[PDB]
Every structure is written in C-alpha cells, then in structure tokens.
Write a protein that binds this ligand. Structure first.
Ligand SMILES: [K+]
Ligand SMILES: [K+]
Ligand SMILES: [K+]
Ligand SMILES: [K+]
Ligand SMILES: [K+]
Ligand SMILES: [K+]
Ligand SMILES: [Mg+2]
Ligand SMILES: [Mg+2]
Ligand SMILES: [Mg+2]
Ligand SMILES: [Mg+2]
Ligand SMILES: [Mg+2]
Ligand SMILES: [Mg+2]
Ligand SMILES: [Mg+2]
Ligand SMILES: [Mg+2]
Ligand SMILES: [Mg+2]
Ligand SMILES: [Mg+2]
Ligand SMILES: [Mg+2]
Ligand SMILES: [Mg+2]
Ligand SMILES: [Mg+2]
Ligand SMILES: [Mg+2]
Ligand SMILES: [Mg+2]
Ligand SMILES: [Mg+2]
Ligand SMILES: [Mg+2]
Ligand SMILES: [Mg+2]
Ligand SMILES: [Mg+2]
Ligand SMILES: [Mg+2]
Ligand SMILES: [Mg+2]
Ligand SMILES: [Mg+2]
Ligand SMILES: [Mg+2]
Ligand SMILES: [Mg+2]
Ligand SMILES: [Mg+2]
Ligand SMILES: [Mg+2]
Ligand SMILES: [Mg+2]
Ligand SMILES: [Mg+2]
Ligand SMILES: [Mg+2]
Ligand SMILES: [Mg+2]
Ligand SMILES: [Mg+2]
Ligand SMILES: [Mg+2]
Lengths: 91, 124, 110, 128
RNA sequence: GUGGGAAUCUGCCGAACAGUUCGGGCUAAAUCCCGAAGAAAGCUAGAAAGCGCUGUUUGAUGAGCCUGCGUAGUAUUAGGUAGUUGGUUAGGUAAAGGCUGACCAAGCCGAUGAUGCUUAGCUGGUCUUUUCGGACGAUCAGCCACACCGGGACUGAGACACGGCCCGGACUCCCACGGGGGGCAGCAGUGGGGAAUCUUGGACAAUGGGCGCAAGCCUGAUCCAGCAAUAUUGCGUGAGUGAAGAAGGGCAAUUCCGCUCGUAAAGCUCUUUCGUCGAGUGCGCGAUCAUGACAUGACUCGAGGAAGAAGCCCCGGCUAACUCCGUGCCAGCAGCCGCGGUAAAACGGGGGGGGCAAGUGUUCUUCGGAAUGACUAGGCGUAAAGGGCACGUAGGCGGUUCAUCGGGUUGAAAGUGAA
C-alpha cells in the first residue's frame, strides 16, 4: 500500500526515524485504538527536518534496522528563525 | 465504566481462596497417622468425634475425620485421605476412606455400605 | 519427488483410500500438496467398487512429472490416464471355483 | 454531527412525551434533514420544514404522537450489505418494529432499501 | 498464525541442446584420489544404443534470508543499551545485513510500559455456554525446540546430525588393571515416585519409505492381535400363562382374601439374540498377474435348555419415595437449613417404596446456574464504591455550507483461508 509517516528524528547520518499511525479494531468493545510504529528509513541527502510528512518505500535490509527508503516529502515542517523573524518584522 | 476506561483497564475476576490446598489438585492422598484422638464439636452439638493427625506424602500436616461406627487406627498407620470437611469441627477439612489400606470395612452395615467399605453380604 | 499415492482413512478393519499428491519425504498421513480423489477398496452393493478423480489436476501433475506408485498405476490405467502396467499382460491364474449360487438376501445357497 | 443529531432526536422524543405539536431544532445539518425525511416517509412525523439552510439553519417539525424512541450512534459502526438483517435483529429492542438508518454511497437510506440496493456503510441510528 | 518480498541454493523426478579425450597414484583394480585441455567416468554385444556422469537452458518440489499486522501477568520493576544506533572502507557468506576488523559521529529503545521478575511451546482445535466469553493445548495433523550436561567443526545438494566424529564434566560397567565402553525423551520391558495409567506379541499380506535394471532385501513407520467398565444415542439378562392368593417375612381400631411382599415365586406352553459346543466350503472380502499376519476369526448348518448373566444410591425440606424395633445431646449423620436429651419419617437394623441401570455413588478439576467483573448485560445520597478542590501533558470526545481527492468505508472479480 502507501505508507505515510511523520519524521520524529533526524540526528543520524543518512538516516531518519519516521512514526507511522494505524487504527486497531478492538473487537470485544467495538472501538478503534490508535497504535504507533516507529520506522527507520534511508535518506541519502539528509534533507528531512523534524515534523515533516514523508512517504516510505520498502527495500532490502540496509542495516540492522533500516528497511525503508524515503520517497517523497509531502508537507514540509515550519521552522521559526529569530533573526529572519526580526528581518521580516522590520518590513 | 466508559468504553475507553474498559479498553485502558480491563475487568478482573473475583477473589476466592482454595479450600483443600493440601491435596494439590489430586483426588486422594496417602498419609501416615501421627496421633489418633477425640475432639468436642462446636456448640450446640455435643459429642466426641474421632480425628487423626495425618502427615501426607507431600509433607503436610492435616486433621482427618474418621467415619462410621468403631475404628482400628493406630499411630504410624497408612490411610487414604479425601476431601470433604466436617461442619462441627473447625479446622478439620478431610475424611479417611474406609475399606482400603489398613482401615477395614464395617461388618454388619447393610444400607449405604459402599460408602463405608463393607462387602455385599451373602444371600442364603 | 512429487508422487501420487494413497493415504489411509476409515477405521480398523474398514479401509478407505485418498489419492493425494505429496512430496516423497512427507509422512503417510501428513503434509500434502493437493488432494486428488478417493477410492473405496471394499465392494459395494452394486457388485463393484467406487472411484473419483480430478482429471485436470492429475493431468497437470503427470505433465510436470509426478511418479505414481504401484497401485496408483493400476487405478490410473483403469481410469484411462496411463498406459497399462507391464505385469498386467500375463493373464490370471486359473483353476476351479466354488460356483454354487447363493441367494443374495440370506447368504444361504439357493 | 453525532452530538447535534442525538441532541435533536432526544429533543424530539422529550417533546413527544409532553404531547406537544411542534418542535424547533437548531443547529441543523443535511444528514439531519435526510434522517427526518426517512422518518416522514415511514410515518413517524407528519411534516418538517427547513429555514435558512445556508447561513443559520432552523428546522420546524410537526408531531402526531407516534414515535417511541430515536437514537443516534455516538461511535463509528461499519456494516456490509449482508450484515444488515442480522444487525437489525440485535439493534431494535422489539426486533420487529423500527428502522435502522445507514449512510451509503447511494445516499442516506434505511435498512430495508439498502438490502435491495446491496450497499453498506456507516450506521447513523435508528427509530422505533 | 496470516499476508507478502528480493539479495540465494536446490540430490532424486519431467523436457531440450552437446560431450564423455589423455597420463599418474593407492601392495591389486575402479564410476576412489591427483594433473592437462573446458567439465567428466565409465559398464554392457551377459544390460550395445540400454544404463551412468559432466556442462548449459529451463519446469516442479524443497531450503536459507527479510518483513507488515496480530499474539501472557506484573508499576510494591522507571530508566535500559556501549558493537550499543548510524556512516565509510576491508574481510567473510550461495545470499541482503554490525555478521565483524579499523576509522568517524553520538546516537538507538522507553509512560502507546523499555529493562527487571514470575509463568508458558504456538496453531487447527477439546469441554461448556442463545450467540459473547471462560478453562485447556491430552489423542490426531501443521510449525518450532531438544536428544546425559556444556563447547566445536568434518563429510555432504541438504546437519552443526536421537541409535555419526572430537573435547571437557558427572554417573556407571568391564579390565589382563595399560585403558577402554555407554546414553530407551524409538517399540516392548524393569526399579523409583505416586491416588493412578498397558504385552519383554505376530507379520511385511495392504499403505508409505530406502537400496536395486530387475529378482529381491530391510522397515517396533504401519497393519493386526493382548491387558484395563477408561469412554461411546448399542445389545442381552426371556415372550405368554399361572390363585392351591402356597410356605415364609413385615405391619395391624388389630376394618375389606385383615393390609402387603404377590402373578411375585413354584408349575405349564413357546423361541434361542449375546455367550457355550460340534462340523463344512472357502479368486466371501480386505488383492491382484501372484503375494492373507488377522483367521482357533467371519459366513452357513447342526446340539441343547429359561438354560450362563442386576446391582448402586436414596425415602425431614430443597427432591420422586413411610412404617416397626434398638439407642437416649451418647453412639452418630450431614451438600445447605440442621437432627439425636425414653414414643427419632433425619442415627443403626427388619419390611416396604423411589431414581438410574452394567452400572451407580464419593473425591478432584472446568463451564453453566452467577446479570457473582455486567461488550451483549450492573453500579457509587442513606447498603461495597465520587478523588478535598482545581489547572493542565498524552489520550478520548467534539458546530454549519460549498468544492477537490480517494487512506478508512463500500460493490464486483481473482488469489488465499492444508487435512
Ligand atoms: K513490562
Ligand atoms: K499453518
Ligand atoms: K548436547
Ligand atoms: K511392506
Ligand atoms: K468406573
Ligand atoms: K437366567
Ligand atoms: Mg538482521
Ligand atoms: Mg515449560
Ligand atoms: Mg448465560
Ligand atoms: Mg494460550
Ligand atoms: Mg504422553
Ligand atoms: Mg548422504
Ligand atoms: Mg561445503
Ligand atoms: Mg543419525
Ligand atoms: Mg536411544
Ligand atoms: Mg518407552
Ligand atoms: Mg510405590
Ligand atoms: Mg512397498
Ligand atoms: Mg525404483
Ligand atoms: Mg450403554
Ligand atoms: Mg449365536
Ligand atoms: Mg463355532
Ligand atoms: Mg482374496
Ligand atoms: Mg477375536
Ligand atoms: Mg416429596
Ligand atoms: Mg424410638
Ligand atoms: Mg438425608
Ligand atoms: Mg434412617
Ligand atoms: Mg458470566
Ligand atoms: Mg456497561
Ligand atoms: Mg450491583
Ligand atoms: Mg454518577
Ligand atoms: Mg465531592
Ligand atoms: Mg470520601
Ligand atoms: Mg460534500
Ligand atoms: Mg476512499
Ligand atoms: Mg472470494
Ligand atoms: Mg479445513
């Protein structure tokens, strides 16, 4: 299918950690429980910040835990910079 | 509780203690009698009931009741012990089986005698 | 090797056989690739025996090279999917027979 | 939508038990209008009118004393086209009288029409 | 368990395409080993165009590896990790990869419960239950782990190999005393523990497997017998008739053959299912071209005489079923309420009766009844139970219209859901 997640960690070289979301159907009580799985992914150029929504593609094992390749960054996270904030404040 | 509460914490079961722990989930045990004595019941009933302190094969010290009329139990005597308490005597939780090991059957018993180990009398 | 063989069903003194395609190292009553049909070794009320087979599946396994065992060769020949076994060209062992007719309902001689 | 839908349905039942003639519902929704249309077709309310549906809606409903209870589900409930009758035999309190209203790709239907159209969806509620 | 993936191997079996040349070595030879070309290996006119091997394309079957989802209890366990998390480069593997050597960065897991502790093989399923759940994982079948306890590799397509090898340890048996040998958690069987669980059987006739061109040889896999009321909606223990209402037993204002056991028994007529005994055919059948342990069986016929076959619990209420005698708060019974102190339907015996029936009672364990952990399907003023009161993190829940999209949802089709 299509796996879309939010990046939660980018402090490795050529690697990101992406959190994916799913809904588990609790059959006895007939409600849906949100569950989370964290996935480690490959990103050669080191471009993903913390907070962006990326899409994952399956691949062969690249490390002990890295099994996914980042394919496209859907929505880019917003970053506040104080100096550029004051620069746009002056205008 | 709300359904969210039941999802986060489930439902437990009721607390109930085991009655016959010394049997250890077995129907009968084999024991050796340490003492054979009498005890008075709880009032208003007044009698002298025959009990025997039995050390079981798993090294447990229990009190057993002796059924029927008359007995021939001695000390260091091998008896078979089954579950089932006696209401008059507090702390006595077991019975001795008549008719096996050394505890003999009762001759002359005619009604309900297989509970006391008596053999079937000969029809003449 | 993939083989077409028989697996035992039924109960004690009452046999029944299932024609199954199995791997050769599998147990007699164990793992199988497919089930292909049934065979009743006992004679029925019509004076004959009963057999059912999956013709397309047996065709597929024979085309990919399965080796039928020695009774399955006989049953596939009588079903007309294989050539006859070599030892059937020999003729029966003749001799006298107890041809006294028996009443079918009572089992006594007529 | 579920909170305001159950809000209006409980308003309707509470005013039915007092023997009133009309009720006013605000806020409203298109799902609520379609639910009321199903009730009017099955004969549990006489008429309903929608006022100012694109700025601030209000709905006036005329009652006659025929509806016993209306519920709207406050949770998500999926149903397929072949589970409708078995679900209906366990949802309605009497298991005979009453209609389960589900939402489908073909629209907001009741449970008897959706069997004929062979389409499932989300259960909205029921009235009996 | 269920569904997938790419970075690999695959003896035997099916189908193509090409070869099978020459020296040496093991006391003697080779389809055993070494070398050269390109890889090899030859046998048979006894199997001469019939087997076998090697290389290259492929089908089929297995195997290695990776992975999404789902899968105990415990917070009176809150921090864990240092090859640990990633990167580069080398080595290794049939194969991706921290699998590991060197170097570089400080990451990785965790309040959506890491780690610590306790317990446990998992599934298809078994028992119970108006659906849900609960207990179990015993037989049979699929996967995994283990083979006296620890550690290794060799051969091999495939093992780190239950009845193969090497090393260490404990136990054990021989020794000629130098040292060797052994692993029933394979089928029987023996001590020990226990409340308790089986024959030191027959045969490869059927099915399956190994070797062999076949002929055939092995197979405690299996098939079939033995023991055990351990289980299962089975069958039988006779069908009629019989009043001298026999004898005898029990009870009685001691009523109506005084009431009952009682047409019950004895006796008379009939028929022999199951079992007993004696014989006969057997390509009846499991098996066909032939091959029958079971089989002293089964089938058919004959002999017989109701002949060989009914117990267990209960009778105060719950709960179907009552009287006499002995005992005297003693002996005793008991699942709960309770009975027994001189007229006991409750203790023990006589008689009579009720319920099941080759069974029937006691104990242990599970579910239901139990709405007695309440999703289906409960509660918190006075009965068990609203935090002393708020603010807020995660989480949960939450207005209206118009348009776009297709992850959830939904309809159809295909694959899969072993037996
Ligand atoms: K834990
Ligand atoms: K499976
Ligand atoms: K070992
Ligand atoms: K055989
Ligand atoms: K029994
Ligand atoms: K008899
Ligand atoms: Mg790995
Ligand atoms: Mg264990
Ligand atoms: Mg119930
Ligand atoms: Mg389990
Ligand atoms: Mg066992
Ligand atoms: Mg080998
Ligand atoms: Mg090798
Ligand atoms: Mg071996
Ligand atoms: Mg062994
Ligand atoms: Mg054994
Ligand atoms: Mg013993
Ligand atoms: Mg064979
Ligand atoms: Mg062969
Ligand atoms: Mg029976
Ligand atoms: Mg007979
Ligand atoms: Mg005979
Ligand atoms: Mg025959
Ligand atoms: Mg026999
Ligand atoms: Mg009564
Ligand atoms: Mg008296
Ligand atoms: Mg009683
Ligand atoms: Mg009595
Ligand atoms: Mg319950
Ligand atoms: Mg509730
Ligand atoms: Mg309550
Ligand atoms: Mg409240
Ligand atoms: Mg308060
Ligand atoms: Mg308080
Ligand atoms: Mg819209
Ligand atoms: Mg969609
Ligand atoms: Mg389908
Ligand atoms: Mg099945």
């Amino acid at each position: 299918k299509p796996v879309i997640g939010t990046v939660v960690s980018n402090k490795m070289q050529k690697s990101v950690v992406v959190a994916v979301d799913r809904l588990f159907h609790n059959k006895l009580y007939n409600r849906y429980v949100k569950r989370t799985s964290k996935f480690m992914a490959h990103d050669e150029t080191n471009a993903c910040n913390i907070g962006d929504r990326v899409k994952l593609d399956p691949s062969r094992p690249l490390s002990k835990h890295k099994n996914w390749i980042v394919a496209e960054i859907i929505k880019k996270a917003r970053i506040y910079s104080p100096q550029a904030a004051a620069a746009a404040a002056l205008s | 509780p709300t359904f969210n509460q039941l999802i986060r914490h489930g439902r437990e079961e009721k607390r109930r203690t085991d009655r016959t722990r010394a049997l250890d989930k077995c129907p009968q045990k084999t024991g050796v009698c340490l003492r054979v004595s009498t005890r008075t019941p709880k009032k208003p009933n007044s009698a002298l009931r025959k009990i025997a302190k039995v050390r079981l094969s798993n090294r447990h010290d229990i009190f057993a009741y002796i059924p029927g009329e008359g007995h021939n139990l001695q000390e260091h005597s091998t008896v078979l012990i089954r579950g089932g308490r006696v209401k008059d005597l507090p702390g006595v939780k077991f019975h001795c089986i008549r008719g096996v090991k050394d505890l003999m059957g009762i001759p002359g018993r005619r009604r309900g005698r297989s509970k006391y180990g008596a053999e079937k009398p000969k029809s003449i | 090797v993939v083989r077409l063989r028989l697996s035992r069903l039924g109960c004690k003194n009452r046999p029944f056989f299932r024609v199954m395609a199995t791997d050769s190292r599998s147990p007699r009553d164990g793992k199988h690739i497919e089930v292909l049909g049934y065979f009743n070794p006992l004679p029925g009320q019509d004076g004959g025996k009963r057999m059912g087979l999956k013709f397309d599946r047996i065709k597929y396994w024979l085309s990919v090279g399965a080796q039928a065992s020695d009774p399955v060769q006989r049953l596939l020949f009588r079903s007309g999917l294989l050539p006859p076994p070599p030892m059937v060209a020999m003729g029966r062992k003749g001799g006298e027979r107890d041809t006294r007719p028996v009443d079918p309902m009572t089992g006594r001689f007529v | 939508g579920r909170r305001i839908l159950n809000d209006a349905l409980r308003t309707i039942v509470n005013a039915e038990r007092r023997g009133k003639a009309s009720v006013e519902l605000k806020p409203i929704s298109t799902v609520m209008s379609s639910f009321l249309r199903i009730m009017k077709e099955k004969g549990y309310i006489k008429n309903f009118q929608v006022h100012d549906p694109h700025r601030v809606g209000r709905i006036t409903v005329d009652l006659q004393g025929r509806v016993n209870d209306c519920k709207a589900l406050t949770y998500r409930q999926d149903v397929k086209a072949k589970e409708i009758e078995e679900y209906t035999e366990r949802t309605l309190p009497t298991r005979q009288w009453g209609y389960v209203v589900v939402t489908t790709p073909d629209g907001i239907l009741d449970h008897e029409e959706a069997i004929k159209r062979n389409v499932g969806g989300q259960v909205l509620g029921f009235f009996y």
